[PDB]
């Protein structure tokens, strides 16, 4: 029958290891753990890509409308997060080379680099990074570097849905949205409202002090920022400076997950809101370990690609890389529980 | 003599009070976050507590006797291995929701992690430079005192500074090196001007001491010199584990910022751009701790900007290749 | 107003050292790992108990049955388990202790030793290990050397309720059951046979006859489910801990657990066997950290490594009886 | 006209690698895939390790270890292979995502094949030093062939043994380390007694001459050689009786200059060992769950075999685990 060996195609995997250093002469030890690392990266980046792009379809084609889906997609998003912390404990790995190694052949690998990686952007856009988010020196050179049948996926990954987008669109369903039925948005806008007004008369009864007119102003600011939740057009405008990017009804639906998780229909896509985000703090985890490292080994110097080295990496560590940025800044918006709208039998039974 | 006793857990496991239940109503997950502070804390008094004893064995003149590196590069080590676990504990604190943490953050106020007394002696006696209202009475007195005793970069500095082979009528390290770069970039000419110029800035000591008073460097031009000379010949018998401690050194440096970040990147998800209790912007303000700012040895980060071809480096004659034996 | 010292109690978690080397007169540097590394791992059993008896009691007084509990009861298992993963890895850390040094203060240590952590034995006890299961040290029971008011705590956590009678009791009560309803049991049992017999007459159709033992084995584990009496026995026997009725629940969650009642059910379980690997793992890295340390005592240690200390091992072993998915009966 | 990332790194065969059976035999399942990528992500860093492995078996073979500028690389790649593995036993983390009834799902189509044919895991075995004994018909041709050279070719361990054995201080007109142990340690015994005879008769005294005489008996059975070599007969010790006595001057010496990196090595092979059984016993952990008491795929019972795989028997360097038996009293080490 079928061996060991043949399954895992390991003709193709132990026999795809070539020291540039040894191929012009002087073979560097370190080389060889190198190239490894950069092979087990990107066999874990296929797999995610293998695990997103099965979850993408399953919005794309509907399935998830059916709720009986939802473990799945929720393993998989899970699943991709233990592989993520897997590939930001790897780093561990390539530090056991010293940059005095390193040097002994990096000579050989311009001008290649993992810029040139097909499947980290892949990755990057499938989950939604969009190109008014990419860093100046990054967003007109990601995709100059692939042509053919490479160029032609990479256009694919930004051409087709992105997990934001579908994502969004499922957000923008939640039940409890509707305006007939359980009215959430005005609801919640009328509980707040109530909620400020009590708080500021409390404050107001308070003996004037100097903790009093400390109270107010801080009252002031956290009214200002909960009750411009409520403004759409503030909304749209923090859209298109890319501050934020999921539509106001998607965002609504996330804030309806959030509020209310324990209710049954709730509690799996709870948890999807929870992986999504965690999938953004581990991709950045990654970039931010990637700097560390290329700082020690690198220092200063420029990148064998042509960026600036570490100085480049260390500008892509930033929120403007987070896909579900809103999804961790709802938390801004955060209420005392009695003033979140509470749930008759009727929608409690849906 | 008993377990518990000699853990004195009549303390460690009396010191659990939930505020919000103080103040009425208890909630659950108020406990996690109480624990994990106090994990943080005793780890905190151990990375002190292996800190000070390796501070000690350079300040009491014990290091210049080789013996006693295995003693010093482990209890680096240690410390590095202790932040490593630090880091990931903070996955234990992040399965609190946001919002469960909303329903007790009001108890807190005004205490924050800026009135953490030991992460404060802990950046001091590292060398994180100033340039503490939180703290008076005994504590402000510690304060003043991490602050002013010898750091671990000013201790690791003067030893640097003591490195054989750096001495200009005996191996001359310095000196042959600038004799070795530049004939080296000459030659490279004949078969640029970039690096040729930062290879170069190595030898300006005006240069670096301009650096030096803006702290954008750390270490004396001396130091600097013995920290090449043990890289470049880290394979000599002498010269082994203390090149161990020097990645050390920058091992714990990546830890401490790994741990500002995975701090930063659970604050974000807490408070979204809610100000923070003890009256930072929060998320915003953090973020800015992660920066080389507090990297106390970025000199020897950055001395990877002047690596060579191994050709290039001054060939050991047997004269010091037996000096550099045990 | 608050200050982070005082919230935290730090006056007492920061005054609890006391090398017992340096109370007898040579300070010796180690000792305060070995001291710092046991109180961390206090204070995260403490918050096992804590997650843990929370997590008993919306069992024991019925809130469970208010299937939005179980969001909460899924949050803190998993939590227990993210904690037993740091916990075993911070045997990293007291390995940075060599034999050598730990040598120089582990006279000042007797007769002290982990076997008189309160906490870890009401762990053991809450989750359900059993008494008459454990592995005996020294001749004896592990209650013998606790006393007085510990002594108590421990006789109340092996007498109330524990996780695995609780779970055991809301799994009897999983919907499907019931034989005048899905029935899942009976059709199980009947679909089980049929596959079995069109599994024959396919095999009819040397190694051909490996084929027939290797069907004839599994024909025999397969049939020997729905023999209670076999159940009955080696429950008695401890060899298995669950009614006969509560494993039909949990093989329910198995097959269906992407039924959306069952999605987090499913979760539950998945998370009881992680908490069952993770208690297992830290035995042995404790066990082979005391191997490099000391070179019954290692011996009591290695033996506790084992299905005996398992309070799950019914939801392992339910993957002994996986059968081809078109096997299950269908859902109407 | 150009090193790409890519080519250079041939993800043209790495990432041309997943065959997915269930695919290819008409219902393809979603998470063999993930069965396949761990597996592969496993030998790479197998090829790796052995990578490492063999490079230090060489600094031994050809006597560069000889020259101590060498014991840096020596100990930071042995060093470098515990910390792959750390990441190896992590790794099951990532399989652990895959539920037992999806699993199920595929298990058929992937009859007979097993680890059992991993080629690599056992070079590894082997390189290091697993017994034949302490323990390939999966194999044949250059496979078979290369295993054979692993089994006769000096291992890590019979090169470890071999530099132990020159370790400085064992000879008997230089320090005499061994003949001082020996001296030092029955006066030590001797007086420890003489104190023990003083103390006042009760069931306490009775204790601790009971304890000095189960003490005095493990020490001093270390300087019995024809035991050493009984043992070592029954496969219970590995090292030489000399080979001993040099790990044991690096272990009671090793702050001295010379000894420290020597030292570092002798705890990185202690690592290796306790990383290769956590890997061995967290497969072990998962197994279960996957199979419950199902035989395995290769023949074996499964989940109870493997168990039995988790055992100082499979510990290569358990004299350097057990040399802690012996350790005594600061006071007792010999001076210099
Ligand atoms: C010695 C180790 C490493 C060094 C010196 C290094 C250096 C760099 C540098 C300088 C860049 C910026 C582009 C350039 O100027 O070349 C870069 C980008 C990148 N590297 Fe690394 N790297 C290392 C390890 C790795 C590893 C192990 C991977 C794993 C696949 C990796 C993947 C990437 C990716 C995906 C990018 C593009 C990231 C982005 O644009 O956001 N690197 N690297
Ligand atoms: C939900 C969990 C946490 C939140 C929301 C949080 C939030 C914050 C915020 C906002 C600050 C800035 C000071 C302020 O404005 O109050 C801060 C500082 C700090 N926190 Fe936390 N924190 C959390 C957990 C922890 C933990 C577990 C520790 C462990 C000891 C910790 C230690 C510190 C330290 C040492 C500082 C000073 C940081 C510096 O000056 O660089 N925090 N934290
Ligand atoms: C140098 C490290 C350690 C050594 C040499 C050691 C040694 C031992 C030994 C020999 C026993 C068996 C009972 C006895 O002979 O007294 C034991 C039991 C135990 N130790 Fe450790 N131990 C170490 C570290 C730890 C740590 C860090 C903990 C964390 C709480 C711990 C907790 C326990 C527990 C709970 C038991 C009882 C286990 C059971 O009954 O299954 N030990 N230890
Ligand atoms: C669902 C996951 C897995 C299952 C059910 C499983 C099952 C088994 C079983 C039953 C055996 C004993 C031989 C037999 O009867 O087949 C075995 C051996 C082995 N497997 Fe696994 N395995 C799994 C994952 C892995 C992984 C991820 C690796 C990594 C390469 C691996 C590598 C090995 C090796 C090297 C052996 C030989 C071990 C020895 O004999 O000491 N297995 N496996
Ligand atoms: N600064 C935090 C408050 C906080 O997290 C805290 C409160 C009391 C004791 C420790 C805390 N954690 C500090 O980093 C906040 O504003 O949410
Ligand atoms: N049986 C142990 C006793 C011990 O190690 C110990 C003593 C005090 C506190 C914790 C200890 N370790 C427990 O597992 C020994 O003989 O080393
Ligand atoms: N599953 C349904 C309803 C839905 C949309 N978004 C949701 C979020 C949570 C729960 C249910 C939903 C759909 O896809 O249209
Ligand atoms: N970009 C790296 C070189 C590098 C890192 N990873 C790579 C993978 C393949 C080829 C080159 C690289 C440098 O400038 O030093
Ligand atoms: N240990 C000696 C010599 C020394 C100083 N710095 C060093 C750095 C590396 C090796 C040796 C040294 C001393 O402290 O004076
Ligand atoms: N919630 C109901 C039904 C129930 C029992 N066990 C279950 C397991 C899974 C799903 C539902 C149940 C109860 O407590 O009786
Ligand atoms: N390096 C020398 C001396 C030596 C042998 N074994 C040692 C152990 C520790 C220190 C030195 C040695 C050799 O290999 O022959
Ligand atoms: N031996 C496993 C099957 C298996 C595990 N890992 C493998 C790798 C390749 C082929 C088969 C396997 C079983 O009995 O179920």
Same mark, same amino acid.
């Given at each position: 029958?079928?061996?060991?060996?043949?399954?895992?195609?390991?003709?193709?995997?132990?026999?795809?290891?070539?020291?540039?250093?040894?191929?012009?002469?002087?073979?560097?030890?370190?080389?060889?753990?190198?190239?490894?690392?950069?092979?087990?990266?990107?066999?874990?980046?296929?797999?995610?890509?293998?695990?997103?792009?099965?979850?993408?379809?399953?919005?794309?084609?509907?399935?998830?409308?059916?709720?009986?889906?939802?473990?799945?997609?929720?393993?998989?998003?899970?699943?991709?997060?233990?592989?993520?912390?897997?590939?930001?404990?790897?780093?561990?790995?390539?530090?056991?080379?010293?940059?005095?190694?390193?040097?002994?052949?990096?000579?050989?690998?311009?001008?290649?680099?993992?810029?040139?990686?097909?499947?980290?952007?892949?990755?990057?856009?499938?989950?939604?990074?969009?190109?008014?988010?990419?860093?100046?020196?990054?967003?007109?050179?990601?995709?100059?570097?692939?042509?053919?049948?490479?160029? *032609?996926? !990479? $256009?694919?990954?930004?051409? +087709? /849905?992105?997990?934001?987008? =579908?994502?969004?669109?499922?957000?923008? &369903?939640?039940?409890?949205?509707?305006?007939?039925?359980?009215?959430?948005?005005?609801?919640?806008?009328?509980?707040?409202?109530?909620?400020?007004?009590?708080?500021?008369?409390?404050?107001?009864?308070?003996?004037?002090?100097?903790?009093?007119?400390?109270?107010?102003?801080?009252?002031?600011?956290?009214? *200002?920022? !909960? $009750?411009?939740?409520?403004? +759409? /057009?503030?909304?749209?405008? =923090?859209?298109?400076?890319?501050?934020? &990017?999921?539509?106001?009804?998607?965002?609504?639906?996330?804030?309806?997950?959030?509020?209310?998780?324990?209710?049954?229909?709730?509690?799996?896509?709870?948890?999807?809101?929870?992986?999504?985000?965690?999938?953004?703090?581990?991709?950045?985890?990654?970039?931010?370990?990637?700097?560390?490292?290329?700082?020690?080994? !690198?220092?200063?110097?420029?990148?064998?690609?042509?960026?600036?080295?570490?100085?480049?990496?260390?500008?892509?560590?930033?929120?403007?890389?987070?896909?579900?940025?809103?999804?961790?800044?709802?938390?801004?918006?955060?209420?005392?529980?009695?003033?979140?709208?509470?749930?008759?039998?009727?929608?409690?039974?849906?």
């Amino acid at each position: 029958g079928l061996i060991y060996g043949n399954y895992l195609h390991l003709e193709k995997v132990l026999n795809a290891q070539e020291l540039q250093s040894e191929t012009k002469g002087n073979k560097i030890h370190d080389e060889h753990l190198f190239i490894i690392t950069h092979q087990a990266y990107e066999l874990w980046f296929k797999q995610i890509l293998w695990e997103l792009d099965s979850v993408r379809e399953i919005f794309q084609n509907g399935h998830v409308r059916d709720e009986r889906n939802m473990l799945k997609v929720v393993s998989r998003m899970h699943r991709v997060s233990v592989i993520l912390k897997l590939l930001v404990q790897q780093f561990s790995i390539l530090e056991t080379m010293t940059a005095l190694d390193f040097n002994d052949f990096r000579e050989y690998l311009s001008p290649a680099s993992g810029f040139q990686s097909l499947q980290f952007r892949l990755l990057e856009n499938k989950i939604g990074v969009l190109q008014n988010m990419r860093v100046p020196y990054n967003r007109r050179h990601y995709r100059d570097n692939f042509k053919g049948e490479e160029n *032609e996926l !990479l $256009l694919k990954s930004e051409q +087709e /849905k992105t997990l934001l987008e =579908l994502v969004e669109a499922w957000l923008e &369903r939640t039940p409890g949205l509707e305006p007939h039925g359980f009215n959430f948005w005005g609801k919640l806008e009328k509980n707040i409202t109530r909620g400020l007004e009590e708080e500021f008369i409390r404050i107001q009864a308070k003996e004037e002090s100097e903790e009093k007119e400390e109270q107010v102003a801080e009252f002031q600011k956290q009214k *200002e920022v !909960l $009750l411009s939740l409520f403004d +759409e /057009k503030r909304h749209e405008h =923090l859209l298109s400076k890319g501050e934020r &990017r999921l539509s106001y009804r998607a965002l609504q639906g996330a804030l309806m997950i959030y509020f209310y998780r324990e209710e049954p229909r709730f509690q799996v896509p709870f948890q999807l809101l929870t992986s999504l985000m965690d999938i953004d703090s581990l991709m950045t985890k990654w970039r931010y370990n990637h700097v560390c490292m290329v700082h020690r080994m !690198l220092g200063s110097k420029a990148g064998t690609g042509g960026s600036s080295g570490y100085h480049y990496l260390r500008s892509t560590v930033s929120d403007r890389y987070k896909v579900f940025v809103d999804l961790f800044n709802l938390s801004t918006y955060l209420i005392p529980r009695h003033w979140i709208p509470k749930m008759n039998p009727t929608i409690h039974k849906f």
